[PDB]
PDB file of C-alpha atoms (C1' of nucleotides) and ligand atoms in Angstrom:
ATOM      1  CA  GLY A   1       1.558  -3.458  -0.680  1.00 12.15           C
ATOM      2  CA  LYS A   2       0.000   0.000   0.000  1.00  7.84           C
ATOM      3  CA  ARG A   3       1.316   3.418  -0.948  1.00  5.12           C
ATOM      4  CA  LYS A   4       1.670   6.192   1.534  1.00  5.88           C
ATOM      5  CA  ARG A   5       0.776   9.842   0.846  1.00  6.89           C
ATOM      6  CA  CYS A   6       3.660  12.028  -0.517  1.00  8.91           C
ATOM      7  CA  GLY A   7       3.330  14.598   2.281  1.00  9.62           C
ATOM      8  CA  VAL A   8       4.313  17.619   0.103  1.00 10.71           C
ATOM      9  CA  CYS A   9       1.629  18.088  -2.563  1.00 11.57           C
ATOM     10  CA  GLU A  10      -0.914  20.892  -2.034  1.00  9.12           C
ATOM     11  CA  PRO A  11      -3.648  18.431  -0.933  1.00 11.83           C
ATOM     12  CA  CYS A  12      -1.154  16.751   1.475  1.00 10.82           C
ATOM     13  CA  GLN A  13      -0.300  20.092   3.041  1.00 12.25           C
ATOM     14  CA  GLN A  14      -3.975  20.945   3.742  1.00 15.07           C
ATOM     15  CA  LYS A  15      -4.486  21.244   7.466  1.00 14.77           C
ATOM     16  CA  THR A  16      -8.331  21.139   7.482  1.00 15.21           C
ATOM     17  CA  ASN A  17     -11.275  19.365   5.831  1.00 13.92           C
ATOM     18  CA  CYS A  18     -13.230  21.227   3.124  1.00 10.65           C
ATOM     19  CA  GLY A  19     -16.510  20.545   4.905  1.00  9.03           C
ATOM     20  CA  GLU A  20     -18.552  20.472   1.654  1.00  8.95           C
ATOM     21  CA  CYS A  21     -17.516  17.309  -0.257  1.00 11.85           C
ATOM     22  CA  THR A  22     -19.464  14.074  -0.029  1.00 13.51           C
ATOM     23  CA  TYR A  23     -16.827  12.421   2.178  1.00 13.34           C
ATOM     24  CA  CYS A  24     -16.727  15.411   4.595  1.00 15.14           C
ATOM     25  CA  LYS A  25     -20.520  15.478   4.831  1.00 12.66           C
ATOM     26  CA  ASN A  26     -20.515  11.698   5.505  1.00 10.39           C
ATOM     27  CA  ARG A  27     -17.400  11.625   7.756  1.00 11.87           C
ATOM     28  CA  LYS A  28     -18.858   9.311  10.415  1.00 11.56           C
ATOM     29  CA  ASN A  29     -19.446   6.506   7.796  1.00 13.65           C
ATOM     30  CA  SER A  30     -16.881   7.246   5.038  1.00 11.60           C
ATOM     31  CA  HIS A  31     -13.561   5.454   4.748  1.00 12.18           C
ATOM     32  CA  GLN A  32     -12.281   8.213   2.371  1.00 12.09           C
ATOM     33  CA  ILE A  33     -10.204  11.310   2.930  1.00  9.09           C
ATOM     34  CA  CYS A  34     -11.643  14.792   2.150  1.00 10.95           C
ATOM     35  CA  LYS A  35     -11.579  15.215  -1.667  1.00 14.71           C
ATOM     36  CA  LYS A  36      -9.558  18.405  -1.269  1.00 12.21           C
ATOM     37  CA  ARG A  37      -6.864  16.537   0.782  1.00  8.93           C
ATOM     38  CA  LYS A  38      -6.462  13.408  -1.375  1.00  8.34           C
ATOM     39  CA  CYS A  39      -2.747  13.233  -2.314  1.00  6.54           C
ATOM     40  CA  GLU A  40      -2.082  14.132  -5.981  1.00  4.85           C
ATOM     41  CA  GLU A  41       0.360  11.189  -6.230  1.00  2.82           C
ATOM     42  CA  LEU A  42      -2.229   8.692  -4.874  1.00  2.00           C
ATOM     43  CA  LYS A  43      -4.713   9.704  -7.616  1.00  2.00           C
ATOM     44  CA  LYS A  44      -2.181   8.413 -10.160  1.00  2.00           C
ATOM     45  CA  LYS A  45      -1.947   4.603 -10.645  1.00  2.00           C
TER      46      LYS A  45
ATOM     47  C1'  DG B   1     -16.336   2.182 -20.432  1.00  2.00           C
ATOM     48  C1'  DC B   2     -16.122   5.887 -16.865  1.00  2.00           C
ATOM     49  C1'  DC B   3     -15.728   7.108 -12.155  1.00  2.00           C
ATOM     50  C1'  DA B   4     -17.747   8.197  -7.436  1.00  2.00           C
ATOM     51  C1'  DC B   5     -17.931   5.627  -3.839  1.00  2.00           C
ATOM     52  C1'  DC B   6     -18.556   1.229  -0.716  1.00  2.00           C
ATOM     53  C1'  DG B   7     -16.347  -1.262   2.467  1.00  2.00           C
ATOM     54  C1'  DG B   8     -12.484  -4.860   3.461  1.00  2.00           C
ATOM     55  C1'  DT B   9      -8.590  -4.314   5.604  1.00  2.00           C
ATOM     56  C1'  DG B  10      -3.131  -3.068   6.010  1.00  2.00           C
ATOM     57  C1'  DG B  11      -0.317  -0.132   8.443  1.00  2.00           C
ATOM     58  C1'  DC B  12       0.231   2.143  12.211  1.00  2.00           C
TER      59       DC B  12
ATOM     60  C1'  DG C   1      -9.115   1.067  17.229  1.00  2.00           C
ATOM     61  C1'  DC C   2      -8.344   4.734  13.749  1.00  2.00           C
ATOM     62  C1'  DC C   3      -7.237   6.356   9.210  1.00  2.00           C
ATOM     63  C1'  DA C   4      -7.762   6.093   4.671  1.00  2.00           C
ATOM     64  C1'  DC C   5      -5.596   2.999   0.317  1.00  2.00           C
ATOM     65  C1'  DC C   6      -7.384   0.679  -3.014  1.00  2.00           C
ATOM     66  C1'  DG C   7     -10.097  -3.447  -5.500  1.00  2.00           C
ATOM     67  C1'  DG C   8     -14.216  -3.879  -7.311  1.00  2.00           C
ATOM     68  C1'  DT C   9     -18.451  -2.339  -9.288  1.00  2.00           C
ATOM     69  C1'  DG C  10     -23.348   0.146  -9.373  1.00  2.00           C
ATOM     70  C1'  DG C  11     -25.233   3.490 -11.756  1.00  2.00           C
ATOM     71  C1'  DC C  12     -24.884   6.097 -15.369  1.00  2.00           C
TER      72       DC C  12
HETATM   73 ZN1  LIG D 101     -14.012  17.600   1.968  1.00  2.00          ZN
HETATM   74 ZN1  LIG D 102       0.708  14.036  -1.548  1.00  2.00          ZN
END
DNA sequence: GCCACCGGTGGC
DNA sequence: GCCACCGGTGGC
């Protein structure tokens, strides 16, 4: 295996959740990070 | 065929 | 136990 976030992309440097995406609005049930914090390198295969 | 997203689970 | 990657696929 599993890749780790890069830690330096703009999403990785975000310090707070966007509060408006589907994953933010469903935080208590979602297994997914805020769409605005998802690492740009993890979006690539 | 695309892609948002469910949910199993690896890594800590 | 929590976080959130990632395989698979429902819904389009
Ligand atoms: Zn968000
Ligand atoms: Zn990153």
